[PDB]
Amino acid sequence: AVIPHGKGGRSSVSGVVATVFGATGFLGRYVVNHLGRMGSQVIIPYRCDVYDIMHLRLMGDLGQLTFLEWDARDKDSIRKAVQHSNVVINLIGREWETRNFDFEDVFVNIPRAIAQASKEAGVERFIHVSHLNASMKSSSKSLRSKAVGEKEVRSVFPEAIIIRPSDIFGREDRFLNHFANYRWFLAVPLVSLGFKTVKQPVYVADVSKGIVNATKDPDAVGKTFAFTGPNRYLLFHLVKYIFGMTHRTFIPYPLPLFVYSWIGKLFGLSPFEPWTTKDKVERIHISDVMPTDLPGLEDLGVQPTPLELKSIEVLRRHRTYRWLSSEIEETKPAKTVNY
Amino acid sequence: TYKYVNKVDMKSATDNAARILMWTELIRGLGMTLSYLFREPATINYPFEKGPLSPRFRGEHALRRYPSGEERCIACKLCEAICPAQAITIEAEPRADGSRRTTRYDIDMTKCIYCGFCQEACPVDAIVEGPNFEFSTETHEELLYNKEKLLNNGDKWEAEIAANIQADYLYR
Amino acid sequence: TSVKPIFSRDLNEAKRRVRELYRAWYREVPNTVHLMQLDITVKQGRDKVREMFMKNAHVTDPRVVDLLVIKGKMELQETIKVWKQRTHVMRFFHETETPRPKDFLSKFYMGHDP
Amino acid sequence: TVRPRSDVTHKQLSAFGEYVAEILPKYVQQVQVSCLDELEICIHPDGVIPTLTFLRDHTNAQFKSLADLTAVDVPTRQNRFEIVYNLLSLRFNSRIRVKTYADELTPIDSIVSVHIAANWYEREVWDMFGVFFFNHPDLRRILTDYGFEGHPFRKDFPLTGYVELRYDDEVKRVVAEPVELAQEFRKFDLNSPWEAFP
Amino acid sequence: QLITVDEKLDITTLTGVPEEHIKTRKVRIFVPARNNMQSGVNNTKKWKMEFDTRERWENPLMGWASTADPLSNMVLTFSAKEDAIAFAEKNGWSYDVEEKKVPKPKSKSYGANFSW
Amino acid sequence: LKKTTGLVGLAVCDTPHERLTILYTKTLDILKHFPKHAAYRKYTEQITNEKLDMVKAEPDVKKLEALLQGGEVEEVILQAEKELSLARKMLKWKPWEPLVEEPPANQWKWPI
Amino acid sequence: SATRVIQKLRNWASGQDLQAKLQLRYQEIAKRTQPPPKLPVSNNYYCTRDGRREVVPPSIIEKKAVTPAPPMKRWELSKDQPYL
Amino acid sequence: ITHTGQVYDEKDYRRVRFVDRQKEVNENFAIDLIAQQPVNEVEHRIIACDGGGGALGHPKVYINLDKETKTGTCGYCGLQFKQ
Amino acid sequence: NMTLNFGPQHPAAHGVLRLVLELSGEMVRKCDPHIGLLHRGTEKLIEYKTYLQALPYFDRLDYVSMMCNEQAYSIAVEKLLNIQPPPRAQWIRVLFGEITRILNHIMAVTTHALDIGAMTPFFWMFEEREKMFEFYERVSGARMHAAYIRPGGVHQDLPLGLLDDIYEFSKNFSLRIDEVEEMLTNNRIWRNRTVDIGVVTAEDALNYGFSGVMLRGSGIQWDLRKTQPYDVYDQVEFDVPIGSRGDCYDRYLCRVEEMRQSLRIIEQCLNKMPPGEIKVDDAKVSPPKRAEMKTSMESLIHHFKLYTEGYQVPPGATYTAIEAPKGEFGVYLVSDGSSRPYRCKIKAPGFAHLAGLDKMSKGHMLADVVAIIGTQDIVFGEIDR
Amino acid sequence: GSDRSRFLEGKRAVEDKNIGPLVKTIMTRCIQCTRCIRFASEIAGVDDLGTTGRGNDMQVGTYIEKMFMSELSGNVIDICPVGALTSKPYAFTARPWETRKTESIDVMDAVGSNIVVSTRTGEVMRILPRMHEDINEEWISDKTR
Ligand SMILES: CCCCCCCCCCCCCCCCCC(=O)OC[C@H](COP(=O)(O)OCCN)OC(=O)CCCCCCCCCCCCCCCCC
Ligand SMILES: NC(=O)C1=CN([C@@H]2O[C@H](COP(=O)(O)OP(=O)(O)OC[C@H]3O[C@@H](n4cnc5c(N)ncnc54)[C@H](OP(=O)(O)O)[C@@H]3O)[C@@H](O)[C@H]2O)C=CC1
């Protein structure tokens, strides 16, 4: 049944079963929507509470999506999820380090275990998602850790696809938003005033379409990829683009990363969810990456979508009424960088 | 025959102003609702005293089985040719005894309308429509009944079905 | 052969209506984007309008063009008013639908249907 | 098992059918009292307002109420749609059917002037079959979706349409989608091949 | 009034049929043939216009037959070749008329089987 | 006399005998301009005549009503006034003429 | 079954006899398991009793004007209750 | 495996369905229950089989137990009758 | 003015309506009701379904009146076949038709009140409606969309205890009506909210095709149960409750009277129901009895063909109207000789009534419109079909 | 025919025999119409079938059990209006109202006999002849069915 037997759409089948582990958060809800609209079964392992997995139940058709509970501490949950799949996708990743899990676990130990069972179960593809510009000694606890794992993944389950996306924008993101949120607290306290650091941002759908195409693309095997996105923007300009599109006053008062590092520490202390933290602060200001030679969305078949276009949808909320109705051509025009 | 529905001495004029000023006529309604808090509520204790039904009550389908143990369904297709919601697919074979039985039977209980056109068409009394009505489900897949969720279903209520069939067979 | 006119007698006469609708729509697209908080750009939409008014650009039976205007105008009424929500209007853009390939090799490669 | 019927009616109504045919010779093409004891005056489409006005306002035939306006679509006939107007006389306790024929591209007049009941029924006939009613105040879709394309009750329209709807998270809207049905509708070819002796 | 026009009355744009179901689809006007299983000739008298047969596949969950051909269960019934060709041309479909096949007259006699 | 004609709108009309005579007599005239032998003129003049015949033969309203076999006279009038309007309207639509166009072939054969 | 005082409360407040017309079924209800029933069922040729084939295809058809049917006889006020 | 097969092949991805779940399968196969029944001996050449009931059983068909070689089996009950 | 689209979800009316309104300050300038929110395609689907397997489409057109909708179709299919139901069946249809008029009116009067704001009348009557459902459940098997009044008769005989239980309900129901009667008829608040609101003049009501209590409320004399009798109504005696001053109140009072008059008709049906069979028994039209199909071959063939193929009603077309509780419900069934219909135009008393909302609710404030929809007894299944 | 039955007596039963692996003769169904006997003798020249016995136990089956082995054999199914002898492979896989019928051409043999392929839910359930005066006049081969 890897023979797709139907007109494309729900109720067809493209015959690729898949275990998409991080399908409770931000990126996986789009992956299930594409894998799903592609009518492929998706065994979605959820450790969450069912009330929060419902939003996934309609992104599929009768029987397409199957759910089962998995906790990273114990295997056999990883084993049974990947037992009947042929595709496996890893989207596990947390910004903060909850008392129970370290960047160690969510980025190395776990993906390793999943991939372990993946190879053990015979799944052909272990699409894994590590961050762009994320290598060892990248001076950020997570990014460094993330790359360490990329190796563990490769070692155990070779011939694996590894996507390393740039910052991911799109609704419900924590990229544009973190910057947008600054409105609430004072003004944007951008380090380097936001200059001197450039970020390539890619829409969630562009990454999601890429992961789906990769699961079904033969040449993709053993191929790393970088989903950079269409334009490289300096941080100060992008925060200014978030503002104006947010329609709230902008003030890029500077300060050193070390202060903001000490600062976020406290925000991280927040028990529920850090509003920001040292690791995040770092990956924003210092983190900057120039892709050089990796296939990318175009290669995998996606036309990266510029941020100039789909920014209404993710910032139209952050406007006060009386500005909500503001259209796009009105939005403060942005500009791209090379650096 | 037709009936009209809506068609001054001081005695009458004072009476009108005694029913407009010292309202006396909204009082005949307040005493009317006071007449009901003192009566016995009709509410039944629901989970413990389920309401009354009839042997005719049409609910969850089930496939009856001959007392011997032989499925009664002989795959006529006299019950999807009438099922107006177009809910039943009963692909069949010779069962390798030489006999005639289903390999497939189906209701999509999210399309059925509990009309009982399948229990009155069946010339053998195989498919019935039982007196269940507590079979709600948290998912969509638990309503697409197969021949084994209808046959063991009918291997459940047969003590409770046959009493109602035997109770209504004459009227049918 | 002879045929009663629906509203116009000669194709030319009717086209007068076809243009009096184009203008209307054109002058409305801007309004809709803003009113229905649609996200597509004025230019983008106005493109769609031409496309449609263009899609039908081959019939020569006045009665048919006399009829598509009406249907056409009706669609304005609804859109001019907000009788149609965002969902309705945005459906003209096949946002989710994956455009079907046309190349033979592109179809042979997928789906037994031609 | 044979209807209890009154022959008085067949005759009385037949006689009215000749009366209407004599009073309006220019528009009535055929009048017939069926054996169900009902009357049907078939009029040329141009006679829609003259024939119905005579019946609404004639002392010997007052047909004040419009029971319904509907359009059977026989695809074979050249003029497919057969608009049918059923009218009731409270004064004489009798009912009449005036039916005329309209093609896809030839509109028929609107009786909203004769009966204001038809303002809605005519909108439904346009939405369902595509017949257009001339000088009809506010003709526009009564029953179909705001963006619906195609006239649904036409015999040439697929039962289940071409578009269906679903909520797509990626776009957060109810998006349409070419119709894919999980179980096609088994079309049963149930129709006997031994005709009944008339 | 009485304007004159010269088209085959293509109402393809008034019908509302998605292009791909008006372009790549062939109607087949034909008078249905008799069910050899029975000898009734009442189902072989009116001309039908049925469309092409596209994919009928299997629903992965329950094994039912699924389809994406909206015009699959469509069998318009006319009363003459002339009135079917007209409708298809009217709606912009391609046709494949098949002439009627009435049995020819075959002479039957009881005695014949008694000759020697 | 009558306080209220049952129907809501129709209001009691005093001088029923009079209003009618005028409406009926006007009509008997509008029919005149109709072609000599037009069913409408031949039949509507047969009715209007009988009602004018009773409108003047009997002077008690309730009585009159039974004869005209209508509802409240306030109705016999409502109708007399509408026939007049049809009579005016008919003289323009000239229904008496020969059929406009015979149905296309087979446009009235139900078992198709 | 209610304390007489409480029920006289409902009869006096309602203004109507209330023990008689109960909205609750105590013994008023027919008991279930009604005894089994026996439902009631020459020259019975179907050709004589043919409702389906009896019908015929529709008939197609100085002088005095004719109404569609004799004018409807006006009703008369109800004897038991003319006005309510 | 159901009385009619259906057992999913180990590789079939159609097995996820039953994970954290199970499979509705009737243990009482009618192929065997009917075989666990005594061949109904009869005296007459032909016998009826109302399905052990009048109007509560199956349409009434007469079976020809005429050859001991074969025990007639009413096509409805699968009951073998031994002449 | 201000275009406030009355809620499609709004608790008022039947929740399937939009009713865009122009608010000239407090008053409503114009109403443009946007129905279509429940058009399931009932008339399209019936063409693809045999005559028996379409009856169900009908009890689901006006779900408040179940068995009267069916009684139309059943009358229409019977006339096309030239067969008549047996005598007992005709009384049973009149017995069930009057129970449906009581239940529709309990629906219309009590739901109008909760829209107005009176909440208790609904609860007292709805318990009386559950008693009546039980009568449908104890004759058909369902409490709703019973599919009991089929072509040729009812599907099955009345159970051995139904007529005694219908007497006990009818015996005590009358007190329940005037209990609502005292609650709403004389209240200052109800009369002010209902009297002189949505007055419709007699000729306008006929012209707009109102044809229902809306027609009779304005004083026009027409019931369709005494004008063009169906079934055995010609043998039962009742008084049409016509009214003057065509205002919501007079229309309310008429609906309360018809509930009372229906108890008079139910009283006669229990007193005079004939011994007999419930379905015409020419097996070509109504299916053969369970014992007969299992013992005689002609009956098995007739059961097999009727359930699988159909009645095959003779070619023709008919418009049959019965007085459904809302108003004249009519089916224009066009039939080819085939077992499945060709067209079935359901005339809905309600498509005409909702059209009248703009004319009837003119010079009226937002609150009056809630009463105007309530007094048309419109349920959107019949209008949307 | 008639709405009811007046036969309050006992029915007859015949004994199912084996005429081959293609024709299932549940001949208690037979209305002794002798179509089978004729076809077997006038179209197919195989005179193996015949009537045996007189009275109400005239059974139209081979006196000795010799299978009806010939091409043109399956046509008996199509020609027996009763379902006494029907097809054994297509025994109980379907029921005719459901079968969607598409008219096509025989490719097994070069006579190119016209045939109707009866398909249900997308798999062919039976192929039965459709009449072509010149090529196959209502008959098809045992192979192409
Ligand atoms: C001669 C001696 C010297 C002079 C002495 C003084 C002169 C004589 C005084 C006589 C006073 C008579 C009563 C006047 C006060 C009562 C209120 C009133 O005047 O009625 C107004 C209104 C009438 O309603 P309606 O019929 O619409 O009349 C207007 C018509 N356009 O009424 C209403 O409709 C209001 C309805 C609102 C809803 C009421 C619901 C029932 C409330 C029951 C309350 C029960 C408890 C009341 C007592 C509480 C005590 C704390
Ligand atoms: N812009 C971006 O977001 C970018 C992301 N990436 C990478 O892509 C991946 C997906 O990102 P995104 O989805 O936004 O990250 P999220 O914060 O949304 O987390 C992804 C999913 O992983 C699950 N998860 C998190 N921690 C654990 C744990 N300890 N055990 C089990 N499950 C867990 C979460 O579910 P639950 O709620 O149950 O914890 C969540 O649904 C990440 O791993 C990240 O490294 C790379 C570049 C940019």
Ligand code: SF4
């Ligand atoms: S259930 Fe009754 S009807 Fe449906 S197939 Fe089995 S036997 Fe025939």
Ligand code: SF4
């Ligand atoms: S009940 Fe009516 S719908 Fe449900 S299955 Fe039996 S027949 Fe089909």
Ligand code: SF4
């Ligand atoms: S043809 Fe069929 S029925 Fe006629 S005899 Fe041969 S077998 Fe018996």
Ligand SMILES: [Zn+2]
């Ligand atoms: Zn048996």
